[PDB]
C-alpha cells in the first residue's frame, strides 16, 4: 500500500499489540473481586482498549512494520481524514481566535487608556465580538480587498 | 580613557551632571536651547563608564553618549 | 583660586580593611575636606561609622569616586560643603572639584567647551567613511 | 587590643595581636626574607637550605615509587627537580622586576617613621644573588635530608 | 606601543592583566591595529595564508611519518579488514602495567592509538603501499611546508609586497582558480588516478621510477586524439574484482557504471577517474570566462550592474556590487566561509552514502568520526559566515554607494525578513515538540498505537524517483517505462539501481516516521540559528533600542542598564547565541546519524524505527543503552583500552559545566571578590615581599561570554566524541 | 594629623613592617663559605641558561635511560594481547 | 622507545617551561 505498508485492520502486529495489552490489563484484573471497584475500572479500560483497536482498523489506517498506524498528509484522499480534515477545523478555529483577537484590539484601541481594557478585559464588548470570529474568512478577505486590513 | 560627547540636541536639564558618580560633566553656557545651557565633558580621564549619565539623559536618542575605550586604572575603577 | 590644604584633622574612625593600599604609595590617591558644624556619625566609603569633627575635617580615601560619593552624601543629608584633591607620590597636589569654585550642575561663565558635537547623533558618518583614518565617527 | 595600623585609621589594613605582637613582630623580624640589611645571597642560602630539605619529605612520601626500594633516590631527584624549576621562577621574576640600575623598592621607613636604607633584596643584582643562594641552598638542603633519611 | 601588544597602544597602556588577555585576542584583527593601511591589511592576510598552508602541509607531513614510523599500514593493505589501523606509539610514564598492556593493540610492539580519520583507507585507495612510499610523500609535505614560509615571507619584503590594486584583480583570479586551481588539479589528479591509483587497484606497482615505461591503457593516447574515447570504457574491472590482485581486473581507464565495487564497497576508482577529468574540462573552460590582458571576457561590474529586473521590484538590482564586494574582505569571507559551509555537509552527506575508499565502509567508526567531525565543522563554518556578514554590515558597508540595491533592500525590509524566520521557528518548535511530548504520552500510557507517526512521504517518494523499490510508489527509476529510466538503462542505471536497493548499504537508507520527526528538529535548529544569525547581522548598524550601535563595533559589552537594559545586544553577541544553537543543530543531527546507522550495523533498523518516535526513546535506547562499555573502561575491577575515552567523557562534562560559570555568573561579582584578594596579598607578610607587575581584575563582559563559549563548545565535542568513538568501537557497530 | 607633603612615605604608610637592620647573626666564616661556593649561581642571566641548559640535559638523561623496572612504559607489554571486536 | 622517551619529555616539559619563560619576559617587558 502507500509507503509499503499495510492497512491496520489486516496487520498482525497490530492484532498482536492490541493482545498483548488486553493481557498487561487481565494481569491486574485478576487480582480483584469481579464486583469490586477496580474491576469494573479495569475492565472499563479493556473494553476501551478493543473500541479504539478496531475504531483504527475501520477507518482506513495505516500500520507499519512496528504495528502502529502511520498518518498519511500527502493529499490522498483516502486519508483526508489524518491532516487535511481536522487542519481545515484547526484553521477555522484558529483564524476565529486571531480575529476576534483583533476585533478587540481594534474596538479599544481609540479609547482613552487603552492598556486598562488589555489587563481587565471589558467582558461586555468581548461578548460582542466573539461571533465575528464566525465569519473571519469573509470579513477579513473584506478589511483586505479595501485596504482596511494592513497599513501602509 | 573612554570618549564622552555631547550632542547638540541636549536641552540641558543638567541631569547627567547630577548623575556623574567621578564629576566627568559640567553644564557650560549655550545659546541653543531654551535652558540655555549645555552638557560638557572636560575631565574623561576619571570616567570610569558606568553610563549612568546615559540613563539620566531625556532626549529622544541620547544628548551624552559614552564610548568605552582605552582602559587605565582609573577607568577600571581600581582602588589597589 | 583653588583652596588650599594644610594638615586639618581628620574624623574619629578606628581604622577598616577598606582604606588606602599601595596604589597611594606608587601612583595617587585623594583627599576630601569639609567643615561641619558639630560632631557626628556618618558612613564612611569605605565601611563602616566614623565620627566627623566640627569644623575642618581631612580625610584621605584611595579613589576619586569614593571622594565624590562621600560628598554627594555631605550636601544631601549633612547639608556641608566638600572640596577634594589629587596627591602625587611627589608631594604634588591638585585641586579637582568642585573644579572653578561651582558644582558643575550650575551653569558658570568661564568653562569652555570639551567634547561637544554640533549635530545630533544619528548624523554621525558611518564606519566606513572613517577606515583608515584614525577617527571614530563620534570623533569629527 | 585591635587598633588601627600604626595609629592611621585610614590605611588599608588592622594591627591585631596576629599582625602585630611582641611575640610574631619578633618571630617575623627574625626570618631570613626580613633581615633588610644583611646579605641577600645569605638570606636565599637559609631559604633554599629549609625548603629542599622540606621538599624531599612529600616527594619521596608521596610519589609513584613511594612503596618500592627506589623511593628516596626518586622523590630526592623530584625534590631537587621542583628547586630547578622554581630557581627559574624566582631568576625570570628578578629580569621582569628589577633593572640592572633601579634601586631598591622596599620601604626606606620604619616603624616609628625614620629613614633607613631600603631592602637591596629588591633590586636586580640584591635578587640575583638571593635566587643563587636559593638554588645553592635548595639542592644541599634536598641532599642533606636525602643524607639523614638513606644513608 | 612600547610593550607587549606592539599593534596596540591602547592595550599596551592598560596597567592589568586584562592587556595580555586582549593582546591575543585581537592579534589576528588587522583592521583594528594601530596605523593599519588597507595595503598592509592585504599583505598581512596574504602572508598569513602562506602561514595557514605551510601548517596544513606541516600536519599532513606528521601523519604520514607517523603511520610509517609507528603504524602497521604495511600489515593494513595486505589484510585491510582485519587490522585496527594504528595513528602513532603512545609514550606515557603515567601509565601503569595494566594501561601499557590494554593499549597494546594491532601487530605493535607498544601502546598505540588506532586511527579514526580514515587515511589508511584513503591512501591505500590512491595507491600507498609501503611504509617507504609513506615516508617520501611526507618529505614532499616537508618541502610544500618550507616552501610555502619562504613565500610567506617573501611576500613581506618590500621588493616583493603586492599593491592593492593586484589583490583586487578580481577578474584574473577567478579565471586562474578555476581553471588552475579547480580545473588542472582536478585533471591532474585523474591523470594519478590513471597512472599509479587504478594499476594499484589491479596489483600493479607503478612508481616514480618505473611509470615511464609502463602504459596506463595498452592502446595508449592514440584513442584520446583520434576521439575514439570508448576504447578507454571497454574492459572495465569485473565485478568480483578483489581490489590490489589481477583477479577479475580489466583494463578500463575511464568508467560510468555507478554504484560500488562489490567487495571493497565503494566507488569504481575508474569511475572516480573519469568524474575528476570530466569536472576538469568544465573548469577550464569556465575558467575563459572573464576579460584579462587579451581583449575578450566579461566585466563582472558590468554584468551585475546589467541584472536589473525592467519593473523596479528589485530598485536598482546589483548596481554597484561589485566594489561593495571588492571593497570588504568580510563580505568575500563572508561568500567564502557560507559556500565552503554548504559542500563540507556535502561533504559529509556524500561521503557516509558514497564512500570512495576501499575497506572504509565497513569501518563504522571510522565512518561516524568522519561524519560526526565534518557535520561540527560546518557548523561552525556557518555561523562564521553570518558573523562576517554582520561585520561587513558596520566595518564595510556603505549605504549610499549601495543606494536602493538588492543589498540596502535587505535592510529596509529587515522586519519582515527577521519576523518571519521567528514565525517558521515558532511553528517548527510547537509542532515537532508537541508531537514528541504527545507519542511520550503515549508511551508512558500503555498505547502506542495512540502516536502521531507521520510518514515521510515526500523524501519517499523522491527515493522512489531514485529507483529505490521499497515504497511501491513507481516514479521515474522506480517505473518501467520512464524516459529517464530507458534513457540511462545502458550505463550508470544497472550499478546505481542494485546499490540504492540493497538495504545494508548506507545509499538512501529506508525512512519512517522516526526520520520524520527528527528531520524537523533539524529545520528547528537551521531556522533558529539562522534567525540569531540574520537578526544579528540585519540589526548590527542599529535598532531602535540602539539607533547607532554601528559607532559602536561589532562586539562591545553592552550600552548599560539604561532604556531598559541592554546586555547582549551586539552583532558579536547574537553569534555568540547563534552558537548554542548550532551546537544543538549538529548534535541533533549527529546523534540521529549515529543511532540511524548503529542499528543498522548491529541488523536492527527496528530499534530506532520504534523507539525514536518520543524522546524517552532516544534517552534510553540511544545514550544510555549505548554508554555501557563507555563508563566501565575504568571501574573498581580494572581497565581496558577504553579506559581514554571513559577520561575524556567524563573530562568532557567537566569542562562544558565549568563553561556554565562563565556564563551565569557575571563580572561584578568576581571583581569585588578579586578586590579582597588584592588587599589580602598586600597585607600577607613574606608575600607581601612579591608583587604582580600587572593589576588582577577580572575578566571582562565580552571575555567572559568567550571564555563560558569555549568552554562550553570545546566540552560539547569532547563528550560526544568519547562517546561516539567508545560505543562505536567497543563492538564495532 | 596623618597626613603630610613634604613625608608623602608616612602618609601613604609605606612603612617597613618587620624590616630589622640588624647585623648578620651567621657563623661569619660561614658566611665565606656561602660567598664564594654559591657565588657563580649569583648572576641570573648565566643562571637561567643554567638551570635551562643543566635541567633540559638532565631532565633527558634520566628519562632517556630509565629502566624498565621503575617506567611502565619502557617495561613494555607483558601479556599476549588480545584480538579485535570484528576478528581485528 | 629510544626517542619517545627523548622527544616525548622534551615537548612535553622543557619547551613548554622555555616558551612560558620566554614568553613572560616579552609580556612583561617595557
Ligand atoms: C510536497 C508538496 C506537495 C503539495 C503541496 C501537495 C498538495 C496537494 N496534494 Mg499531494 N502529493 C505529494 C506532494 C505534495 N502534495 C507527493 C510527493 C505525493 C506522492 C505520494 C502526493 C500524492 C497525492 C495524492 C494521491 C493526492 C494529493 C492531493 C493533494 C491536494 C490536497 C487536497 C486538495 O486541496 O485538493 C485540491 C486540489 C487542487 C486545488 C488541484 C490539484 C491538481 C493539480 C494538478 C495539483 C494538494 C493540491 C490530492 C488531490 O489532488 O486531490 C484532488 C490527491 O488525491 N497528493
Ligand atoms: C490578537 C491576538 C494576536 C494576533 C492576531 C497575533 C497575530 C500574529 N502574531 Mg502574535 N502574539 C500575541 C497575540 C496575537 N498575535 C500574543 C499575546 C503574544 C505574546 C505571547 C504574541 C507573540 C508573538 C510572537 C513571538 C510572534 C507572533 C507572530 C504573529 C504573526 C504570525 C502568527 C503567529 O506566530 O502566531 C503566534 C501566536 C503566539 C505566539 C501567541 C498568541 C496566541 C494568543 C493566545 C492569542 C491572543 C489571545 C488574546 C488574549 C485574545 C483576547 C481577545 C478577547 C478580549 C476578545 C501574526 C501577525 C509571529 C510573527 O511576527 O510572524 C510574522 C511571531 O514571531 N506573535
Ligand atoms: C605531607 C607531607 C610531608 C611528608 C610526607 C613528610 C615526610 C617526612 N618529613 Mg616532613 N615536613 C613537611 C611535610 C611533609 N614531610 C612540612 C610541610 C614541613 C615544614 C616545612 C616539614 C618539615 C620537616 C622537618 C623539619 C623534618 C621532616 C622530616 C620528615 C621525615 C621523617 C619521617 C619519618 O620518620 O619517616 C617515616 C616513617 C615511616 C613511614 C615508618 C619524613 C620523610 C625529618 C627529616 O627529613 O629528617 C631528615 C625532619 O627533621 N619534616
Ligand atoms: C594557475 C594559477 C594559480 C593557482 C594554481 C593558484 C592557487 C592558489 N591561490 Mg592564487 N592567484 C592567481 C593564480 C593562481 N592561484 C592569480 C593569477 C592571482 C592574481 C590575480 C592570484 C591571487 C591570489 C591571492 C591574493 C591569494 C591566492 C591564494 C591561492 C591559494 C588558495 C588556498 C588554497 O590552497 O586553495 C586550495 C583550493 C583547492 C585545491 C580547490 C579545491 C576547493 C574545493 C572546495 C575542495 C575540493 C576538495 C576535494 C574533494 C579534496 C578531496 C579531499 C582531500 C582529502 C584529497 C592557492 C594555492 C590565497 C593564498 O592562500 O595565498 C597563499 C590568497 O590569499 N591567490
Ligand atoms: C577563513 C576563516 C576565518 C578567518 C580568516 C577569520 C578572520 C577573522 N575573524 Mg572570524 N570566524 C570564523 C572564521 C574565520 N575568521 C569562523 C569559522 C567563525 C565561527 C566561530 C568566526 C567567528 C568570528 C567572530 C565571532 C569574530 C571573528 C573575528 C575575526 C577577526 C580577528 C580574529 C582574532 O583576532 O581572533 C584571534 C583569536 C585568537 C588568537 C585565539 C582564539 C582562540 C579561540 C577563541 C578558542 C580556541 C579553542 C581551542 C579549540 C581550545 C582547545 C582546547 C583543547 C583541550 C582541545 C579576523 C578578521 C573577530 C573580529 O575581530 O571581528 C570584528 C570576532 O569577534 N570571527
Ligand atoms: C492538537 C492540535 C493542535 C494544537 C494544540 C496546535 C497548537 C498551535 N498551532 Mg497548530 N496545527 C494543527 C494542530 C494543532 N496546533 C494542525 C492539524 C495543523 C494543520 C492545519 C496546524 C497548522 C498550524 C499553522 C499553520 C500554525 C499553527 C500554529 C499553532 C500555534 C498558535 C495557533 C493559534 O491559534 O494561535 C491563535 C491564532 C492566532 C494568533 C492567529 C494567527 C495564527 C493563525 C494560525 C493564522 C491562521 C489564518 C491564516 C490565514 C492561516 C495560515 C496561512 C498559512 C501559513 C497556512 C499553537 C502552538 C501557528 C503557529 O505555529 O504560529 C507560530 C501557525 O501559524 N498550527
Ligand atoms: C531546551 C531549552 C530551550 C528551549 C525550549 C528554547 C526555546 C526557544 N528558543 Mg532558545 N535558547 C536556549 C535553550 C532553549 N530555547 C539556549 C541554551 C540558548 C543560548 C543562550 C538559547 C538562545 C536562544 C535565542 C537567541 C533564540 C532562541 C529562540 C527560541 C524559540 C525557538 C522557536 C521555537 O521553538 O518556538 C516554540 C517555542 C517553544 C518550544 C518554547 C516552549 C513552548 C512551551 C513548551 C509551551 C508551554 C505550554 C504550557 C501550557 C505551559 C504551561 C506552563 C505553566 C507554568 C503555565 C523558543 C522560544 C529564538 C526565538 O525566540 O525565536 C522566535 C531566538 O531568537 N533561543
Ligand atoms: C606532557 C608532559 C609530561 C611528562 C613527560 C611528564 C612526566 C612525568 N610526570 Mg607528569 N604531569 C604533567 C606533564 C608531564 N609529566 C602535567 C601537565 C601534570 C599536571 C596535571 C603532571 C602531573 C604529574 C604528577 C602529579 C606526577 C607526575 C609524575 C611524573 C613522572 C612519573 C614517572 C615516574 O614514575 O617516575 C617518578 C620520578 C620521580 C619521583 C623523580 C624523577 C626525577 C626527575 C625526572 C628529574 C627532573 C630533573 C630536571 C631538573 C627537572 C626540570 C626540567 C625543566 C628544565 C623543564 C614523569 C617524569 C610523578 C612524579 O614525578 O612524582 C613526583 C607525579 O607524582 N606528573
Ligand atoms: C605536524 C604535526 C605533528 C604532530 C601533531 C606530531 C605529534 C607527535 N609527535 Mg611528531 N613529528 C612530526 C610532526 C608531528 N608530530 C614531524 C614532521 C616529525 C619529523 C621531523 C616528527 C618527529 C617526531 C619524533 C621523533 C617523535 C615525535 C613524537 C610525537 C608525539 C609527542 C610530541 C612530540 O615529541 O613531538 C615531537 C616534535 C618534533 C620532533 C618536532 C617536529 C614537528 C614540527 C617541526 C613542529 C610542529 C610545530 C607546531 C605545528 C606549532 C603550531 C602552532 C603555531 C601556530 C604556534 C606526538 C604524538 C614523539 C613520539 O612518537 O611519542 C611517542 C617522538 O619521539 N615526533
Ligand atoms: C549577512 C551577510 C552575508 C551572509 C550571508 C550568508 C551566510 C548566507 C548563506 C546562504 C546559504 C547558506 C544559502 C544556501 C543556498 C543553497 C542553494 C541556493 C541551493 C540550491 C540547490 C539547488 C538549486 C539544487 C537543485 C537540484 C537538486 C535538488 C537535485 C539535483 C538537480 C539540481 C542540482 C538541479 C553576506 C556574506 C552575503 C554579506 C552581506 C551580509
Ligand atoms: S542629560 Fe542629556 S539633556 Fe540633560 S544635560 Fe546631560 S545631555 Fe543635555
Given at each position: 500500500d502507500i509507503a509499503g505498508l499495510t492497512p491496520c485492520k489486516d496487520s498482525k502486529q497490530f492484532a498482536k499489540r492490541e493482545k498483548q495489552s488486553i493481557k498487561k490489563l487481565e494481569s491486574s484484573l485478576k487480582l480483584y473481586a469481579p464486583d469490586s471497584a477496580p474491576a469494573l475500572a479495569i475492565n472499563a479500560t479493556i473494553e476501551k482498549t478493543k473500541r479504539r483497536f478496531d475504531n483504527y482498523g475501520k477507518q482506513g489506517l495505516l500500520c507499519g512494520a512496528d504495528?502502529?498506524?502511520?498518518?498519511?498528509?500527502?493529499?490522498?484522499?483516502?486519508?483526508?481524514?489524518?491532516?487535511?480534515?481536522?487542519?481545515?477545523?484547526?484553521?477555522?478555529?484558529?483564524?476565529?481566535?486571531?480575529?476576534?483577537?483583533?476585533?478587540?484590539?481594534?474596538?479599544?484601541?481609540?479609547?482613552?487608556?487603552?492598556?486598562?481594557?488589555?489587563?481587565?478585559?471589558?467582558?461586555?464588548?468581548?461578548?460582542?465580538?466573539?461571533?465575528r470570529g464566525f465569519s473571519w474568512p469573509i470579513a477579513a478577505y473584506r478589511e483586505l480587498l479595501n485596504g482596511e486590513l494592513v497599513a501602509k | 580613557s573612554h570618549s564622552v560627547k555631547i550632542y547638540d540636541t541636549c536641552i540641558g536639564c543638567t541631569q547627567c551632571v547630577r548623575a556623574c558618580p567621578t564629576d566627568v560633566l559640567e553644564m557650560i553656557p549655550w545659546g541653543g536651547c531654551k535652558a540655555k545651557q549645555i552638557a560638557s565633558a572636560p575631565r574623561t580621564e576619571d570616567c570610569v563608564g558606568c553610563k549612568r549619565c546615559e540613563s539620566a539623559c531625556p532626549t529622544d536618542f541620547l544628548s551624552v553618549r559614552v564610548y568605552l575605550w582605552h582602559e587605565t586604572t582609573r577607568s577600571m575603577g581600581l582602588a589597589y | 583660586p583653588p583652596e588650599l590644604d594644610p594638615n586639618t584633622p581628620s574624623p574619629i574612625f578606628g581604622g577598616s580593611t577598606g582604606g588606602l593600599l599601595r596604589k597611594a604609595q606608587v601612583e595617587e590617591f585623594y583627599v576630601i575636606t569639609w567643615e561641619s558644624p558639630k560632631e557626628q556619625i556618618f558612613e564612611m566609603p569605605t565601611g563602616g561609622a566614623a565620627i566627623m569633627r566640627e569644623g575642618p575635617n581631612l580625610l584621605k580615601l584611595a579613589r576619586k569616586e569614593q571622594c565624590l560619593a562621600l560628598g554627594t552624601r555631605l550636601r544631601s543629608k549633612y547639608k556641608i560643603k566638600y572640596q577634594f584633591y589629587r596627591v602625587f607620590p611627589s608631594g604634588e597636589v591638585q585641586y579637582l572639584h568642585p573644579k572653578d569654585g561651582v558644582y558643575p550642575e550650575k551653569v558658570n561663565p568661564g568653562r569652555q567647551g570639551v567634547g561637544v558635537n554640533f549635530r545630533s547623533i544619528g548624523k554621525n558618518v558611518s564606519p566606513i567613511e572613517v577606515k583608515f583614518t584614525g577617527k571614530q565617527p563620534y570623533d569629527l | 587590643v585591635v587598633q588601627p595600623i600604626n595609629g592611621d585609621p585610614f590605611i588599608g589594613s588592622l594591627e591585631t595581636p596576629v599582625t602585630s605582637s611582641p611575640l610574631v613582630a619578633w618571630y617575623l623580624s627574625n626570618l631570613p626574607g626580613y633581615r633588610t640589611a644583611v646579605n641577600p645571597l645569605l638570606r636565599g642560602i637559609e631559604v633554599g637550605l629549609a625548603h629542599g630539605f622540606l621538599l624531599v619529605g612529600p616527594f619521596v612520601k608521596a610519589g609513584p615509587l613511594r612503596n618500592t626500594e627506589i623511593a628516596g633516590q626518586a622523590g630526592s631527584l623530584a625534590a631537587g627537580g621542583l628547586v630547578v624549576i622554581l630557581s627559574i621562577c624566582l631568576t625570570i621574576y628578578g629580569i621582569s622586576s628589577f633593572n640592572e640600575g633601579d634601586p631598591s623598592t622596599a620601604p626606606s621607613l620604619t616603624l616609628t617613621g625614620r629613614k633607613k636604607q631600603p631592602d637591596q633584596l629588591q633590586t636586580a643584582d640584591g635578587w640575583a644573588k638571593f635566587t643563587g643562594g636559593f638554588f645553592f641552598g635548595g639542592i644541599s638542603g634536598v641532599i642533606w635530608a636525602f643524607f639523614l633519611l638513606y644513608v | 606601543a612600547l610593550r607587549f601588544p606592539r599593534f596596540s597602544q591602547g592595550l599596551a597602556q592598560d596597567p592589568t592583566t586584562r592587556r595580555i588577555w586582549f593582546g591575543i585576542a585581537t592579534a589576528h584583527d588587522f583592521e583594528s591595529h594601530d596605523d593599519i593601511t588597507e595595503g598592509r591589511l592585504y599583505q598581512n592576510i596574504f602572508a598569513s595564508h602562506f602561514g595557514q598552508l605551510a601548517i596544513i602541509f606541516l600536519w599532513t607531513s606528521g601523519n604520514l611519518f607517523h603511520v610509517a614510523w609507528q603504524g602497521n599500514f604495511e600489515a593494513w593493505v595486505q589484510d585491510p579488514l582485519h587490522v585496527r589501523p594504528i595513528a602513532h606509539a603512545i609514550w606515557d610514564p603515567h601509565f601503569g602495567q595494566p594501561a601499557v598492556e590494554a593499549f597494546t593493540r594491532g601487530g605493535a610492539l607498544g601502546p598505540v592509538n588506532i586511527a579514526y580519520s580514515g587515511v589508511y583507507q584513503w591512501w591505500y585507495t590512491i595507491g600507498l603501499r609501503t611504509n617507504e612510499d609513506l615516508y617520501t610523500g611526507a618529505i614532499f609535505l616537508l618541502f610544500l611546508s618550507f616552501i610555502s614560509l619562504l613565500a610567506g615571507w617573501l611576500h613581506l619584503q618590500p621588493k616583493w609586497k603586492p599593491s592593492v590594486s593586484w589583490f583586487k584583480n578580481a577578474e584574473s583570479r577567478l579565471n586562474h582558480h578555476l581553471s588552475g586551481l579547480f580545473g588542472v588539479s582536478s585533471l591532474a589528479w585523474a591523470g594519478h588516478l590513471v597512472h599509479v591509483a587504478i594499476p594499484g587497484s589491479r596489483g600493479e606497482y607503478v612508481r616514480w621510477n618505473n611509470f615511464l615505461s609502463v602504459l596506463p591503457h595498452p592502446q595508449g593516447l592514440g584513442p584520446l586524439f583520434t576521439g575514439q574515447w570508448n576504447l578507454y570504457a571497454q574492459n572495465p574491472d569485473s565485478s568480483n574484482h578483489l581490489f590490489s590482485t589481477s583477479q577479475g581486473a580489466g583494463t578500463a581507464i575511464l568508467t560510468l557504471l555507478g554504484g560500488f565495487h562489490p567487495q571493497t564497497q565503494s566507488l569504481w576508482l575508474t569511475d572516480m577517474a573519469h568524474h575528476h577529468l570530466a569536472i576538469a574540462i568544465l573548469f577550464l573552460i569556465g575558467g575563459h570566462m572573464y576579460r584579462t590582458n587579451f581583449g575578450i571576457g566579461h566585466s563582472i561590474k558590468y554584468i551585475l550592474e546589467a541584472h536589473i529586473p525592467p519593473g523596479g521590484r528589485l530598485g536598482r538590482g546589483h548596481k554597484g556590487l561589485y566594489d561593495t564586494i571588492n571593497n570588504s574582505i568580510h563580505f568575500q569571507l563572508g561568500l567564502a566561509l557560507a559556500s565552503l559551509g554548504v559542500i563540507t555537509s556535502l561533504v559529509a552527506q556524500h561521503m557516509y552514502s558514497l564512500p570512495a575508499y576501499a575497506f572504509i565502509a565497513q569501518d563504522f567508526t571510522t565512518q561516524a568520526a568522519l561524519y560526526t567531525h565534518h557535520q561540527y565543522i560546518a557548523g561552525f563554518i556557518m555561523t562564521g559566515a553570518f558573523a562576517h556578514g554582520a561585520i561587513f554590515f558596520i566595518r564595510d558597508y556603505n549605504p549610499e554607494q549601495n543606494a536602493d540595491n538588492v543589498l540596502a533592500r535587505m535592510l529596509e525590509h529587515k522586519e519582515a525578513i527577521i519576523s518571519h524566520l521567528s514565525w517558521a521557528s515558532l511553528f517548527l518548535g510547537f509542532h515537532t515538540l508537541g508531537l514528541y511530548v504527545h507519542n511520550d504520552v503515549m508511551l508512558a500510557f500503555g498505547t502506542p498505537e495512540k502516536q502521531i507517526l507521520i510518514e515521510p512521504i515526500f523524501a519517499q517518494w523522491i527515493q522512489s524517483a531514485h529507483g529505490k523499490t521499497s515504497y511501491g510508489f513507481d516514479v521515474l527509476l522506480s517505473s518501467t517505462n520512464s524516459p529517464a529510466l530507458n534513457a540511462g538503462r545502458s550505463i550508470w542505471l544497472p550499478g546505481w539501481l542494485?546499490?540504492?536497493?540493497?538495504?545494508?548499504?548506507?545509499?538512501?537508507?529506508?525512512?519512517?516516521?522516526?526520520?520524520?520527526?527528527?528531520?524537523?528538529?533539524?529545520?528547528?535548529?537551521?531556522?533558529?540559528?539562522?534567525?540569531?544569525?540574520?537578526?544579528?547581522?540585519?540589526?548590527?548598524?542599529?535598532?531602535?533600542?540602539?539607533?547607532?550601535?554601528?559607532?559602536?563595533?561589532?562586539?562591545?559589552?553592552?550600552?548599560?542598564?539604561?532604556?531598559?537594559?541592554?546586555?547582549?545586544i551586539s552583532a558579536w553577541d547574537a553569534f555568540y547565541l547563534a552558537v548554542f544553537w548550532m551546537l544543538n543543530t549538529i548534535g541533533w543531527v549527529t546523534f540521529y546519524w549515529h543511532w540511524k546507522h548503529i542499528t543498522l550495523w548491529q541488523g536492527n533498523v527496528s530499534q530506532f524505527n520504534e523507539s525514536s518516535t518520543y524522546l524517552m526513546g532516544w534517552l534510553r535506547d540511544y545514550l544510555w543503552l549505548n554508554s555501557s562499555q563507555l563508563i566501565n573502561g575504568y571501574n573498581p575491577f580494572g581497565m581496558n583500552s577504553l579506559s581514554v575515552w571513559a577520561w575524556m567523557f567524563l573530562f568532557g562534562h567537566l569542562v562544558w559545566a565549568t563553561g556554565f560559570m562563565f556564563l551565569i555568573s557575571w563580572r561584578g561579582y568576581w571583581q569585588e571578590l578579586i578586590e579582597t584578594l588584592a588587599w589580602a596579598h598586600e597585607r600577607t607578610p613574606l608575600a607581601n615581599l612579591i608583587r604582580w607587575r600587572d593589576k588582577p581584575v577580572a575578566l571582562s563582559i565580552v571575555q567572559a561570554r568567550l571564555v563560558g563559549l569555549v568552554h562550553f563548545s570545546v566540552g560539547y565535542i569532547f563528550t560526544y566524541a568519547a562517546f561516539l568513538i567508545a560505543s562505536t568501537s567497543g563492538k564495532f557497530g | 594629623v596623618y597626613f603630610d607633603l613634604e613625608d608623602l612615605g608616612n602618609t601613604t604608610g609605606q612603612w617597613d613592617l618587620y624590616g630589622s637592620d640588624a647585623p648578620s647573626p651567621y657563623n661569619s666564616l660561614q658566611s665565606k663559605f656561602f660567598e664564594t661556593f654559591a657565588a657563580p649561581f649569583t648572576k641570573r642571566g648565566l643562571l637561567l641558561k643554567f638551570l635551562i641548559l643543566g635541567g633540559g640535559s638532565t631532565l633527558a638523561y634520566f628519562s632517556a635511560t630509565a629502566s624498565g623496572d621503575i617506567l611502565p612504559i619502557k617495561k613494555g607489554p607483558q601479556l599476549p594481547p588480545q584480538l579485535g571486536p570484528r576478528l581485528g | 622507545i629510544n626517542l619517545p622517551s627523548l622527544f616525548v619529555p622534551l615537548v612535553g616539559l622543557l619547551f613548554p617551561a622555555v616558551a612560558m619563560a620566554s614568553l613572560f619576559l616579552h609580556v612583561e617587558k617595557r
Open positions: 504495528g502502529l498506524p502511520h498518518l498519511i498528509v500527502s493529499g490522498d484522499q483516502r486519508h483526508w481524514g489524518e491532516f487535511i480534515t481536522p487542519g481545515i477545523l484547526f484553521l477555522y478555529i484558529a483564524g476565529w481566535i486571531g480575529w476576534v483577537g483583533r476585533s478587540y484590539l481594534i474596538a479599544i484601541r481609540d479609547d482613552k487608556k487603552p492598556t486598562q481594557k488589555e489587563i481587565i478585559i471589558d467582558v461586555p464588548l468581548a461578548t460582542r465580538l466573539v461571533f | - | - | - | 542494485n546499490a540504492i536497493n540493497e538495504n545494508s548499504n548506507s545509499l538512501f537508507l529506508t525512512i519512517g516516521p522516526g526520520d520524520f520527526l527528527v528531520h524537523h528538529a533539524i529545520a528547528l535548529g537551521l531556522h533558529t540559528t539562522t534567525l540569531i544569525l540574520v537578526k544579528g547581522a540585519l540589526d548590527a548598524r542599529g535598532s531602535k533600542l540602539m539607533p547607532d550601535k554601528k559607532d559602536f563595533g561589532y562586539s562591545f559589552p553592552c550600552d548599560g542598564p539604561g532604556r531598559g537594559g541592554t546586555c547582549d | - | -
